[PDB]
Amino acid sequence: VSFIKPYRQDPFVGHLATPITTSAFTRAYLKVLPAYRPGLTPLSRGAEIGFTHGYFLIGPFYTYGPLRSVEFSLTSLAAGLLAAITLLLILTVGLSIYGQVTYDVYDNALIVKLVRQMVGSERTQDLPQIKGTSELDTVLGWQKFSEGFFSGGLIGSIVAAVGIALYSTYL
Amino acid sequence: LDGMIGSSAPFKNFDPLGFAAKADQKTLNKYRESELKHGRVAMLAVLGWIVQEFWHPLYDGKLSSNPLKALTEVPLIGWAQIFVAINVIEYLQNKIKELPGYRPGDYLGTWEWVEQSDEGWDSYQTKELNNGRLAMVAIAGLIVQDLITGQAALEQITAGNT
Amino acid sequence: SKAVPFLEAPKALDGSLPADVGFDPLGLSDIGFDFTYLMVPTKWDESRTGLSALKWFREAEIKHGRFAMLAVLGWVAVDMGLRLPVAKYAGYNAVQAHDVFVKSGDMTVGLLAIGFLEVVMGAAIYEMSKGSDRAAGEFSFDPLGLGKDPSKYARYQVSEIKNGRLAMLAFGGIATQAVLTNSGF
Amino acid sequence: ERSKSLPFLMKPKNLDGSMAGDVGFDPLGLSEINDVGVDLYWLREAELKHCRLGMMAAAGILFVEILGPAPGFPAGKSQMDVFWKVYAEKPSLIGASLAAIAILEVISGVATTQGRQNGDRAPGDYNFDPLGFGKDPAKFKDLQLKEVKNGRLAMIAAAGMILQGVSTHQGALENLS
Amino acid sequence: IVAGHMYKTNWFLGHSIKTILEAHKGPFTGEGHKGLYEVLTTSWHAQLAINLALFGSLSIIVAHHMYAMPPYPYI
Ligand code: CLA
Ligand code: CLA
Numbered sequence A: 001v002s003f004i005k006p007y008r009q010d011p012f013v014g015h016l017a018t019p020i021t022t023s024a025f026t027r028a029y030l031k032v033l034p035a036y037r038p039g040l041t042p043l044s045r046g047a048e049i050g051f052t053h054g055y056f057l058i059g060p061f062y063t064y065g066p067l068r069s070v071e072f073s074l075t076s077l078a079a080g081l082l083a084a085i086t087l088l089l090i091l092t093v094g095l096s097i098y099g100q101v102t103y104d105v106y107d108n109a110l111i112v113k114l115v116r117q118m119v120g121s122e123r124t125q126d127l128p129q130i131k132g133t134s135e136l137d138t139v140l141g142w143q144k145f146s147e148g149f150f151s152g153g154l155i156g157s158i159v160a161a162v163g164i165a166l167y168s169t170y171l
Numbered sequence B: 001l002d003g004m005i006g007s008s009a010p011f012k013n014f015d016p017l018g019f020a021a022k023a024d025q026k027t028l029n030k031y032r033e034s035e036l037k038h039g040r041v042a043m044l045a046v047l048g049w050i051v052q053e054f055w056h057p058l059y060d061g062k063l064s065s066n067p068l069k070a071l072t073e074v075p076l077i078g079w080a081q082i083f084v085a086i087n088v089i090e091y092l093q094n095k096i097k098e099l100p101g102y103r104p105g106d107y108l109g110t111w112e113w114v115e116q117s118d119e120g121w122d123s124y125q126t127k128e129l130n131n132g133r134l135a136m137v138a139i140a141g142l143i144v145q146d147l148i149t150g151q152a153a154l155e156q157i158t159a160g161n162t
Numbered sequence C: 001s002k003a004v005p006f007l008e009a010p011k012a013l014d015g016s017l018p019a020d021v022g023f024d025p026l027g028l029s030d031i032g033f034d035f036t037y038l039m040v041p042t043k044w045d046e047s048r049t050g051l052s053a054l055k056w057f058r059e060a061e062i063k064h065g066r067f068a069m070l071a072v073l074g075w076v077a078v079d080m081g082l083r084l085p086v087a088k089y090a091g092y093n094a095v096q097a098h099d100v101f102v103k104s105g106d107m108t109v110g111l112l113a114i115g116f117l118e119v120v121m122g123a124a125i126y127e128m129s130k131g132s133d134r135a136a137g138e139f140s141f142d143p144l145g146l147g148k149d150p151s152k153y154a155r156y157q158v159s160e161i162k163n164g165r166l167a168m169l170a171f172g173g174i175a176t177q178a179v180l181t182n183s184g185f
Numbered sequence D: 001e002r003s004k005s006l007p008f009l010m011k012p013k014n015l016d017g018s019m020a021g022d023v024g025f026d027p028l029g030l031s032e033i034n035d036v037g038v039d040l041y042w043l044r045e046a047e048l049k050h051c052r053l054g055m056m057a058a059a060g061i062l063f064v065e066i067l068g069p070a071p072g073f074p075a076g077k078s079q080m081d082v083f084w085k086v087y088a089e090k091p092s093l094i095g096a097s098l099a100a101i102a103i104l105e106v107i108s109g110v111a112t113t114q115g116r117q118n119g120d121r122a123p124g125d126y127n128f129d130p131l132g133f134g135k136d137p138a139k140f141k142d143l144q145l146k147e148v149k150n151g152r153l154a155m156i157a158a159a160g161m162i163l164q165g166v167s168t169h170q171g172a173l174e175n176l177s
Numbered sequence E: 001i002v003a004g005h006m007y008k009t010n011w012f013l014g015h016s017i018k019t020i021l022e023a024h025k026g027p028f029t030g031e032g033h034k035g036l037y038e039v040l041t042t043s044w045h046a047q048l049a050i051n052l053a054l055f056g057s058l059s060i061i062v063a064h065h066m067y068a069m070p071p072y073p074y075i
């Protein structure tokens, strides 16, 4: 037996079907992640990603910041929370500008078919081309994704701060 | 008790009680899943039993080297995290089980690459199954001996309580 | 078979070997391992077809029988006296003479001489494995000449193997009992 | 087909009848070695050199032990220990003898390899017949057989004397009685 | 000395490096070490690569073990 084969029977792609790229564990694990989980609107994907990211982002800032405390301090928690929230704001700014400069679409998975059927004799790159058919690959989709990331980041950072305070106080 | 993998020399197609002679393919897939999960968990349990007995670096020593005693000494908030990790792993396994072409114990998805399996692949799967069975028997014996005697594996062996 | 009638036969005990009655409950005469490879670990020669485990076992049984017969003769001799006409062999039984003579540098000489003879006759065994017509235990040693008359040779064969089995068991008893018929435990 | 010495063994292929003392006694088949510059020619030359060396050594030990040492030489009757007494007082004699033997052995090895290569010299042949004791044939074969048998016996004897002198630290005939 | 009696040279005894390498295949490695014997017996540069890498590593190991366990008197 051989556990490495050309990806999708194409020996010319710059890719391989290894026990890591195309394993059943990899398939299921990546399909349960918010970025690829089926049945999620882009706002929901952004909200979940932001929640998880703020939740694990408050950690390093609170623990190793400039205002640490070997005991529990409200000032240390506030400093870590503010740093995490501002980092989430910076990431949201990056997401917003990236989406602004990347896509020009409001409804995908159709425009591609329209220009593959009804011809696309225009300036292209909006009618024709169009990389990716996901709802995340639109101006509207990425805007809602960034909004969800930002809101979920705030909520997750607050939740993680509350959990840290409870763990440090009642344990 | 089929052309299934796991038939070794000492007892080929070992079904003395005929559990598989009447079961359909789905029940046999369930049986293989249960056997493989038990074998893997038992291999981990036996290795942990021994290593814990002669090495417990974590928790700043303490956590008495006898198993079934350190079971009641872990902070019980580390128990919760292990439980949640096992639960997430088995949720992922459940998600794997609905992938097309799924095989009972195959969570790596080897059916994607292994069409027309060889004798080496079958032999390695049988090796895993037999090691799992031996580890199941060994961990059952470990737990029973520690319950009845009160000493751990390398402690009972060292003293000579055999 | 002719012994243990509820077992038919091992597989290779057809009767081509002398003193054959068919007694082999464990089927030991069917191991596929050519024990000549315990001597010459590799095939070495391209003409080395191989030696059956049964023939190697027959050679080993004959050698064991001869060793045990000589051994019981010697052990019985040292129980009733009969020391060599030389010093340093006073009386020290048989349960203790072995160690005291291993100490006195002559059991090593005996080991060397017996090993020399064993190596020569094991070269004979290896040639038999290579495919010489020599049969197991046949070193062509008939100086006095009581080996002619093929019927007498076959009778003496079966006699030697049966006596060797008896002597093996008798030596086992004598060494285990530390002798009872001629001495004490 | 069977070796004359060992009837339970087939005739060693390389030993037909030619060499003096040939009775087919090659149980380990060492005559069939054809590697590391070792063959029947080299083995026979080594055997003959060993025979001659053992004869000389046994004769020397027996002579010195029976008739005593030469004038001006140490005594003691232990030939394995009197060597260090000779070296303690006449080291130059030992060194000169060693150098001479070394040169003669280099010549012997060169001669052995050359005679093996362009076959014209029998193994152990050095054209050393100053008194003409083996000129004619039908006596040369008998002399070869006598030399081989005496040399093997003296090889065994000299090895025994060496071991006895090293272990017991006494004379050969001293060990005898 | 024991390790020197491993590879088959002139008798029916020892190992063939070609047979050892060619038997070490695997599911993840395809043909495995097949052809490596031909590579290392027909290219001086491959032998130099292996020998020089292991030789430099050995020199560094020697350097460590030197001061770690001084092997000379008054060094
Ligand atoms: C069924 C498996 C199992 C279970 C329930 C336990 C349970 C325990 N172990 Mg343990 N252990 C195991 C296997 C197991 N062990 C194995 C296989 C080893 C060998 C590496 C060890 C080595 C070990 C040491 C050295 C120590 C413990 C200790 C402990 C105790 C505290 C928890 C801890 O720190 O774990 C620590 C566990 C590890 C460091 C290794 C765990 C590695 C896991 C089992 C493999 C990967 C699991 C993966 C997430 C799931 C599989 C993926 C896939 C197959 C689905 C606790 C009673 C500590 C103690 O107090 O001893 C008395 C301690 O110091 N264990
Ligand atoms: C298995 C055979 C065997 C063995 C191992 C021994 C061993 C021994 N015997 Mg012994 N013995 C035997 C058979 C044997 N005997 C037989 C059959 C007889 C009756 C004829 C005797 C009669 C006897 C006497 C009368 C005495 C001993 C003594 C001894 C001891 C002193 C000898 C010694 O130190 O080793 C020396 C080395 C050896 C014994 C190894 C044997 C090597 C032989 C000589 C090689 C040749 C064998 C021969 C040619 C075989 C021919 C077959 C083939 C070639 C055709 C020693 C423990 C003496 C003693 O003090 O015992 C307490 C003593 O006084 N034995």
Ligand SMILES: C/C(C=C=C1C(C)(C)C[C@H](O)C[C@@]1(C)O)=C/C=C/C(C)=C/C=C/C=C(C)/C=C/C=C(/C=C/[C@@]12O[C@]1(C)C[C@@H](O)CC2(C)C)CO
Binding pocket: D080, D081, D083, D106, D108, D109, D110, D113, D162, D166
């Ligand atoms: C390459 C080579 C030569 C060659 C070649 C050439 C040149 C290329 C030409 C051809 O083309 C090929 C070839 C291969 O032939 C090899 C050379 C040979 C060697 C390596 C020489 C070894 C000799 C050693 C001997 C012979 C020593 C013996 C020791 C004794 C000790 C005596 C004692 O008294 C002492 C001292 C103390 C006492 O208490 C007691 C004892 C122990 C008895 C007995 O004597």
Ligand SMILES: CC(/C=C/C=C(C)/C=C/[C@@]12O[C@]1(C)C[C@@H](O)CC2(C)C)=C\C=C\C=C(C)\C=C\C=C(C)\C=C\[C@@]12O[C@]1(C)C[C@@H](O)CC2(C)C
Binding pocket: C094, C095, C096, C098, C099, C169, C171, C172, C173, C175, C176
């Ligand atoms: C067990 C044994 C043989 C058992 C045979 C059995 C069961 C046979 C059973 C059958 O035949 C019957 C009954 C009936 C058949 O129809 C069926 C079978 C089945 C065929 C032999 C032991 C044999 C055991 C032997 C030979 C042990 C020998 C030990 C020796 C010699 C020790 C020597 C010493 O050297 C040391 C070690 C130390 C020195 O200090 C001291 C001394 C004493 C000198």
Ligand SMILES: CC(/C=C/C=C(C)/C=C/[C@@]12O[C@]1(C)C[C@@H](O)CC2(C)C)=C\C=C\C=C(C)\C=C\C=C(C)\C=C\[C@@]12O[C@]1(C)C[C@@H](O)CC2(C)C
Binding pocket: D091, D092, D093, D094, D095, D096, D097, D099
């Ligand atoms: C090598 C030699 C002696 C070597 C001795 C050594 C190494 C001993 C060294 C030691 O003892 C010391 C020093 C001190 C100890 O603490 C250490 C040792 C090591 C123990 C003598 C050679 C001695 C060499 C001699 C005597 C040579 C004689 C040559 C003659 C007669 C030649 C004649 C011809 O040349 C003509 C005349 C005409 C030609 O055409 C024909 C011929 C016939 C060839």
